[PDB]
From Swiss-Prot:
3',5'-cyclic AMP binds at residues 80, 281. This is cAMP and cAMP-inhibited cGMP 3',5'-cyclic phosphodiesterase 10A. Residues 7-324 form the PDEase domain. The gene is PDE10A. Plays a role in signal transduction by regulating the intracellular concentration of cyclic nucleotides. Can hydrolyze both cAMP and cGMP, but has higher affinity for cAMP and is more efficient with cAMP as substrate. May play a critical role in regulating cAMP and cGMP levels in the striatum, a region of the brain that contributes to the control of movement and cognition. The tandem GAF domains bind cAMP, and regulate enzyme activity. The binding of cAMP stimulates enzyme activity. Composed of a C-terminal catalytic domain containing two divalent metal sites and an N-terminal regulatory domain which contains one cyclic nucleotide-binding region. 3',5'-cyclic GMP binds at residues 80, 281. Abundant in the putamen and caudate nucleus regions of brain and testis, moderately expressed in the thyroid gland, pituitary gland, thalamus and cerebellum.
Length: 330
């Protein structure tokens, strides 16, 4: 019930944070894993906003309140949590730094914020679940159910006293950035991804893709959102493999609920079907991750290291299937 708000101690502490100097170099690389630096995550986000958008872009106190309240509105679920938020924001930073002048100041600020907020108040349940069992959210939001909710949660946090980091935009730019954020969050609905990628592939291959065309820009930003949302698959193998453990902890807890309601879950959500996980991952990389990074690399060549890493992880899942797996810790 309701929107959580950070404490005075929380945001003032973030204000004083300084990013250890060794990390400045690493944070620029696509493969950077925030995993080992949990105390630093909010500070890492501040640093990225300041590098991409400038130290003056947002009033610092409002930005620190906003970030710490966002953190407090992610739930203690295994995967769709604060760590995932910051990981996705970092991928977006790396894409923006590598393609900086393709995007406007307003787009960079909107997209970094959109990434941090994109899974706000996730409960650990899929759109499939909310709609199968008529959760009130599915009645309010007939499609892209959770994504519409995440955007509503974002607006709710902006509306908290002292939290509106966008208030200094002109009335026009304010409307525009909220629309950038809305479209970007909605785009994280993987249901929309398949259509988006196919459209972009066609536009690219025929030569009609045009970044001065707003609808084209929206679609490219959409695919950037997918690429960032799934970026666990572009990390080093042990990081990818550990993250998969968290994703599945979430899926299996959902499957357990569907069994109580008399429906056998899809195998992916069935904790009694872990043997199917490697082939499930192969299917996901072939159907979703590989095509995504493939298209993103055609459109934004500097993003190629994401595709190379995704291919390397596809190879690792193939190794698992062939029984070649070596020692893993979890
Ligand atoms: O759609 N998803 O939520 C989702 C996300 C990541 C995934 N990895 N493997 C399957 C899979 C499904
Ligand atoms: Ni999501
Ligand atoms: Ni997500």
């Amino acid at each position: 019930a309701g929107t959580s708000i950070c404490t005075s101690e929380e945001w003032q502490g973030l204000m004083q944070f300084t990013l250890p100097v060794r990390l400045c170099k690493e944070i620029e690389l696509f493969h950077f894993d925030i995993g080992p630096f949990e105390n630093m995550w909010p500070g890492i986000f501040v640093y990225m906003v300041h590098r991409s958008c400038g130290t003056s872009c947002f009033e610092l106190e409002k930005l620190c309140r906003f970030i710490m309240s966002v953190k407090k509105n992610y739930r203690r679920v295994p995967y769709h949590n604060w760590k995932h938020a910051v990981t996705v924001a970092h991928c977006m930073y790396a894409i923006l730094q590598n393609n900086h002048t393709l995007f406007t100041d307003l787009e960079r600020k909107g997209l970094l914020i959109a990434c941090l907020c994109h899974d706000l108040d996730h409960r650990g349940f899929s759109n499939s679940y909310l709609q199968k069992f008529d959760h009130p959210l599915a009645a309010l939001y007939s499609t892209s159910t959770m994504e519409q909710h995440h955007f509503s949660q974002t607006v709710s946090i902006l509306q908290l006293e002292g939290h509106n980091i966008f208030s200094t935009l002109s009335s026009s730019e304010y409307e525009q950035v909220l629309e950038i954020i809305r479209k970007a969050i909605i785009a994280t609905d993987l249901a929309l991804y398949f259509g988006n990628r196919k459209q972009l592939e066609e536009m690219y291959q025929t030569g009609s893709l045009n970044l001065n065309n707003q609808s084209h820009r929206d679609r490219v930003i959409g695919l950037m959102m997918t690429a960032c949302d799934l970026c666990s698959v572009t990390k080093l193998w042990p990081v990818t493999k550990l993250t998969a453990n968290d994703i599945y902890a979430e899926f299996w807890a959902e499957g357990d609920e569907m069994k109580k309601l008399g429906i056998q879950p899809i195998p992916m959500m069935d904790r009694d079907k872990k043997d199917e996980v490697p082939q499930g991952q192969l299917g996901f990389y072939n159907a979703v991750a590989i095509p995504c990074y493939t298209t993103l690399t055609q459109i934004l060549p500097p993003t190629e290291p994401l595709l190379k890493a995704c291919r390397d992880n596809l190879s690792q899942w193939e190794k698992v299937i062939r029984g070649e797996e070596t020692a893993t810790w979890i």
